[PDB]
Amino acid sequence: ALWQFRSMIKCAIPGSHPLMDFNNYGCYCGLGGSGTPVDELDRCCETHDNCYRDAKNLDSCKFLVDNPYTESYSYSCSNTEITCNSKNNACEAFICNCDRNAAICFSKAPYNKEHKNLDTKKYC
Ligand SMILES: [Ca+2]
Numbered sequence: 242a243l244w245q246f247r248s249m250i251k252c253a254i255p256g257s258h259p260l261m262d263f264n265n266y267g268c269y270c271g272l273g274g275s276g277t278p279v280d281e282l283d284r285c286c287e288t289h290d291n292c293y294r295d296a297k298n299l300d301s302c303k304f305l306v307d308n309p310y311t312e313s314y315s316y317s318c319s320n321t322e323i324t325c326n327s328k329n330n331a332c333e334a335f336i337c338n339c340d341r342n343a344a345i346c347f348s349k350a351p352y353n354k355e356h357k358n359l360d361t362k363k364y365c
Contacts, residue, residue, distance in 0.1 A: 245311045246340050252318035253344035257352060266353035268365030279356035279364030285346035292339030302332035310336065321348045 267283025325337035
């Protein structure tokens with residue numbers, strides 16, 4: 242599962258904190274969800290969960306294969322500049338390219354300080 246995704250979001254977050262703060266927060270973190278976010282740091286979970294919808298379903302390695310999240314792959318870093326193991330393949334390159342705009346996008350969006358274990362009668 243997404244466990245070297247924690248390895249991933251140290252790399253692309255100069256400043257902000259991963260999962261420990263980033264996992265419980267905001268409204269629609271999961272497959273579908275459609276209201277909107279609360280702040281757009283539920284909106285960086287919007288992009289990685291719908292890139293993951295196309296990854297659980299994927300033409301390069303189709304799912305008699307069984308390779309869902311972070312098990313075989315690892316990655317690269319620096320600006321925020323996350324990618325993959327830089328010889329990067331077809332389907333191993335896709336699941337690490339969704340976990341890229343997970344790690345990068347926690348530094349692109351705002352943050353839920355607020356929705357941080359949420360309320361959403363309110364936000365969604
Ligand atoms: Ca969603």
